[PDB]
Ligand binder design. Sequence first.
Ligand SMILES: C=C1C[C@@]23CC[C@H]4[C@@](C)(CCC[C@@]4(C)C(=O)O[C@@H]4O[C@H](CO)[C@@H](O)[C@H](O)[C@H]4O)[C@@H]2CC[C@]1(O)C3
Ligand SMILES: O=c1ccn([C@@H]2O[C@H](COP(=O)(O)OP(=O)(O)O)[C@@H](O)[C@H]2O)c(=O)[nH]1
Length: 408
Amino acid sequence: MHVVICPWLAFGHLLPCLDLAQRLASRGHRVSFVSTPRNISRLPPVRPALAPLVAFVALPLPRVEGLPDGAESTNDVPHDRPDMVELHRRAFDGLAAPFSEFLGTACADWVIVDVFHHWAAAAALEHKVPCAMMLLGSAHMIASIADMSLAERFSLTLSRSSLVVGRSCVEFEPETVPLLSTLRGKPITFLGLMPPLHEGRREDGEDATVRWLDAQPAKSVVYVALGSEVPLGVEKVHELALGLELAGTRFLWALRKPTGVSDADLLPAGFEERTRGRGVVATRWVPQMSILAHAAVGAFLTHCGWNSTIEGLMFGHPLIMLPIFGDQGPNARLIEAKNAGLQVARNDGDGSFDREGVAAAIRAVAVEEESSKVFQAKAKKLQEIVADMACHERYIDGFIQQLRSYKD
Ligand SMILES: C=C1C[C@@]23CC[C@H]4[C@@](C)(CCC[C@@]4(C)C(=O)O[C@@H]4O[C@H](CO)[C@@H](O)[C@H](O)[C@H]4O)[C@@H]2CC[C@]1(O)C3
Ligand SMILES: O=c1ccn([C@@H]2O[C@H](COP(=O)(O)OP(=O)(O)O)[C@@H](O)[C@H]2O)c(=O)[nH]1
């Protein structure tokens, strides 16, 4: 089959979509990976064996006054500037006509579109190409939802599609997957957990963060990362920093800067001087898969993005959970219910946290001998499911067969 994939302009979408593209190409299907040029230039390379079977289709973002050139993704357009978020949505919607022009002559068997691709789903109707909408999260998240604004963009994409695709399986969510049939009348299918393949990202194993981990004791380091886009304002950064310090563990923190904040204002006064001997802060993109694979990493302080949840558990790390938005709350509650992580205490109403809550969660998951042992054992039970690579390849096979059967 020729499958056209259209990920949302966000690295939590682009990365699993490029993994899915290569998995499809590995079974001898061909993929057109449709995105914008700077987003494509920042992606891991396709294996030489798959080069002619994964075609990158670069559609330039139209120019919009107030949106900087090269600001193509949620990693480049910060949530803490809602005016720029809106300009980026306008630019994204401007891809409609070029996408429809591409699709008409593409000889596509399927289009797989992301949650806000209402125009791509409209093009698939116009060109009589079956269209699957990606909702690459948990069955629990899809069940939550089942129970131009984002909700309206989502609703329109869904209505125009034929199929909804989740990223889970009955082994991981036995309570939910059998209960799901349709989402607003559309059949739901699960393509498995699709944990990333060994070195699919071709990260730098000589990265300064990994060389620091090489020097630390086994399972001694709390890795701290909040994915590629969620906002954390400078006051919240300071509470997270002081909580990490207070709990006393070794730490490696991949931190994105709030907009406007100088390196000098980013962290509490003296925090890096005091913690230099046990912790490292990196304000750049880090090789998260190399870090989570590392023997030095014990617990993962995560925002519970679905990629980070899967990546943490595929190496049996218990989670210290700080959900910020979207599916993160549902993801954190799902893992807490499996006893493999603990959420940081939040104020009910505004969802605030403080250094004491951060420190208390770190001590419970990573330090206290009895609780930490149970969290580790429960995370290892989940790793048996998440890291069953053969199980997840069978689900990819099953997904391809379901795409084939709709055509026939
Ligand atoms: C009523 C609602 C249900 C809701 C659940 C979460 C859901 C939606 C945002 C739809 C898309 C997927 C998902 C899981 C989500 O949070 O996606 C994320 O949205 C961000 C923008 O908010 C993007 O920048 C991210 O890249 C994307 O990963 C969805 C629709 C609007 C909402 O308010 C929230
Ligand atoms: O410094 C970073 C930050 C994030 N990631 C990767 O970016 C993705 C983040 O996706 P997730 O669903 O966890 O959160 P989002 O960014 O969508 O909020 C994951 O695959 C991470 O491995 C990374 O490699 N390095």
